[PDB]
Amino acid sequence: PSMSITRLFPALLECFGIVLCGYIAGRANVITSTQAKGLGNFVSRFALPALLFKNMVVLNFSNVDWSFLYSILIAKASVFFIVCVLTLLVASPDSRFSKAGLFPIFATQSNDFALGYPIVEALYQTTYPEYLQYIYLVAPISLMMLNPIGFIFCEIQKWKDTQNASQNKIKIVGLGLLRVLQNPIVFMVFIGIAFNFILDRKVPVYVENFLDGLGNSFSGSALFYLGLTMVGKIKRLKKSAFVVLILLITAKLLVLPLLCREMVELLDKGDSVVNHTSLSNYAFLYGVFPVAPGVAIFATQFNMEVEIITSGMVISTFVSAPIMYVSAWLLTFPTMDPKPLAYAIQNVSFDISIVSLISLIWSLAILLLSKKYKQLPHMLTTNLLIAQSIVCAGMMIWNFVKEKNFVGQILVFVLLYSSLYSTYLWTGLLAISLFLLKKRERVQIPVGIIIISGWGIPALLVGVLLITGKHNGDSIDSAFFYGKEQMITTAVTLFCSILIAGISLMCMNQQLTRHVLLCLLLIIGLFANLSSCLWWLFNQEPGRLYVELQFFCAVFNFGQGFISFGIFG
Numbered sequence: 390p391s392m393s394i395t396r397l398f399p400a401l402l403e404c405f406g407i408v409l410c411g412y413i414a415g416r417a418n419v420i421t422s423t424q425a426k427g428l429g430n431f432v433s434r435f436a437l438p439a440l441l442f443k444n445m446v447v448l449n450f451s452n453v454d455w456s457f458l459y460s461i462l463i464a465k466a467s468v469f470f471i472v473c474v475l476t477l478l479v480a481s482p483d484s485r486f487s488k489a490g491l492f493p494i495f496a497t498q499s500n501d502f503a504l505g506y507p508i509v510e511a512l513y514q515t516t517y518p519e520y521l522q523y524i525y526l527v528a529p530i531s532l533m534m535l536n537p538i539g540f541i542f543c544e545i546q547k548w549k550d551t552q553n554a555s556q557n558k559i560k561i562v563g564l565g566l567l568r569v570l571q572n573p574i575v576f577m578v579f580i581g582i583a584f585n586f587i588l589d590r591k592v593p594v595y596v597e598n599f600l601d602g603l604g605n606s607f608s609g610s611a612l613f614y615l616g617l618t619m620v621g622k623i624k625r626l627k628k629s630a631f632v633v634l635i636l637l638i639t640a641k642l643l644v645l646p647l648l649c650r651e652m653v654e655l656l657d658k659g660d661s662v663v664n665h666t667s668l669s670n671y672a673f674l675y676g677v678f679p680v681a682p683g684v685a686i687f688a689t690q691f692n693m694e695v696e697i698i699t700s701g702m703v704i705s706t707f708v709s710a711p712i713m714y715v716s717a718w719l720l721t722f723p724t725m726d727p728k729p730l731a732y733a734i735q736n737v738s739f740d741i742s743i744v745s746l747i748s749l750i751w752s753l754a755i756l757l758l759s760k761k762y763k764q765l766p767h768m769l770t771t772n773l774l775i776a777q778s779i780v781c782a783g784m785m786i787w788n789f790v791k792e793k794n795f796v797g798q799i800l801v802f803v804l805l806y807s808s809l810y811s812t813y814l815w816t817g818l819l820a821i822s823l824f825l826l827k828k829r830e831r832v833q834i835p836v837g838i839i840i841i842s843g844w845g846i847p848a849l850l851v852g853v854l855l856i857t858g859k860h861n862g863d864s865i866d867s868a869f870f871y872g873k874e875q876m877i878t879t880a881v882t883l884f885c886s887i888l889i890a891g892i893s894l895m896c897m898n899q900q901l902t903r904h905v906l907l908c909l910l911l912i913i914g915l916f917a918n919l920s921s922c923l924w925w926l927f928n929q930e931p932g933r934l935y936v937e938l939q940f941f942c943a944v945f946n947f948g949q950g951f952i953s954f955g956i957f958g
């Protein structure tokens with residue numbers, strides 16, 4: 390295929406597993422905040438410049454598609470210009486230049502080497518090997534292009550804050566540019582380009598082992614340091630600052646991908662449809678890379694906007710994981726016929742259910758071992774997390790069982806289906822329990838009946854499904870394993886929970902917020918699945934928007950554990 394999309398989930402597990410290792414290590418103080426700087430110094434002063442130098446010396450410039458460079462750079466320059474001019478118009482006077490510097494750098498500078506390259510490598514190393522070159526071209530040329538302008542605005546702020554020092558523009562410009570030249574990425578690219586020419590792309594045999602040994606250590610070491618620098622970083626922001634952060638992460642993780650993709654489709658006027666397509670898709674995925682950790686370092690160096698930039702970098706890194714996974718698969722679906730596409734959505738479901746189950750077990754354990762599960766609603770909320778866990782656990786088994794045998798398929802189907810419906814009801818059961826708790830303190834909530842229904846009724850619905858329906862189990866999609874009746878069952882379950890929740894939340898309006906938020910964020914997913922099921926039935930020959938909806942309702946179905954992991958973890 391045009392992109393080895395199956396290799397992305399392992400790459401993301403490498404990337405974000407090692408970031409999680411660093412995060413766990415810093416949390417557990419396996420490495421303290423002052424000890425982490427030793428790893429950071431190694432990463433940035435040795436491993437990264439070695440990696441840059443090696444790849445820049447090796448690079449065949451007579452094989453670079455400059456259109457991709459110009460496309461991504463013009464897209465980054467666009468987002469930079471937009472965020473800069475918009476920041477200059479929106480922000481308040483005494484902070485507008487610090488923000489106009491760092492917010493555009495934020496919105497454009499990608500976590501290219503640590504996170505981007507493992508992902509690009511996995512996706513494209515075998516299908517389109519030259520796509521790995523553009524990491525080392527785009528990322529540094531991006532700094533040389535755009536970072537000096539942002540630093541110039543930060544130097545304007547440093548100048549303006551220092552009202553004793555109404556000094557020269559030449560110093561402002563020069564110092565901004567000097568900070569760009571002092572960046573190891575920038576100067577090791579200049580140095581590597583010089584030795585690309587001097588050596589005719591040949592790393593000396595007796596220097597190669599060194600550059601290999603240092604450079605190859607970068608990814609793991611940098612991803613680990615990234616985890617360590619994410620510990621204790623998401624400070625409680627003002628509502629205004631949180632909205633700004635959402636808009637900046639939207640610029641980096643949505644707008645920049647869309648503009649990158651558009652620019653490749655504008656400028657890659659070359660002939661090949663499939664090469665144009667894969668390059669376009671690579672441009673989108675390039676745009677989805679997180680904010681580079683270096684932006685937080687610049688912010689610290691200036692002492693400017695540091696909470697927003699650090700928190701945004703942290704959140705951007707984590708938000709890039711699902712967006713990147715989701716986007717890459719979504720872009721790949723137009724290349725797939727309906728059977729490998731059904732396989733694809735089950736693979737997606739399995740992948741998400743793994744990491745969601747892990748998030749769920751963690752969140753469950755926290756709520757249990759904190760003894761939060763004693764309180765109401767938190768006991769039923771823990772049951773909602775239990776419900777989500779059994780959903781994810783079932784889907785993992787269906788991937789193992791999809792070709793095993795008829796009986797195991799049915800049994801595994803019982804489990805997955807039933808937990809699937811149990812989540813649906815616990816959405817509603819929680820929501821009406823919120824109303825019941827809100828109604829008056831003298832009301833004793835019918836916890837036992839609620840639990841018995843929250844698992845009996847889903848078991849009953851799967852029993853009904855087995856009885857009234859028939860085995861459609863030749864079908865790869867487990868949500869279609871029992872066909873028309875299955876999706877009607879799904880639809881009724883969701884609608885019941887939706888009515889229960891809407892009515893109860895209404896009466897409740899006429900601890901609480903996190904559970905209301907949970908129910909609503911589940912309800913948008915329940916409606917995604919409700920839509921999916923009636924649409925399935927009738928469409929009969931569903932379009933591209935259906936496989937994308939099928940995909941996003943699968944992302945919800947199994948990724949809803951991450952919702953719980955955010956709300957209570």
Ligand SMILES: O=C(O)Cc1c[nH]c2ccccc12
Nearest residue numbers: 500501502503611615681682
């Ligand atoms: O953004 C990048 O990929 C480069 C980078 C520079 N210093 C870093 C520290 C940790 C992780 C990545 C980087």
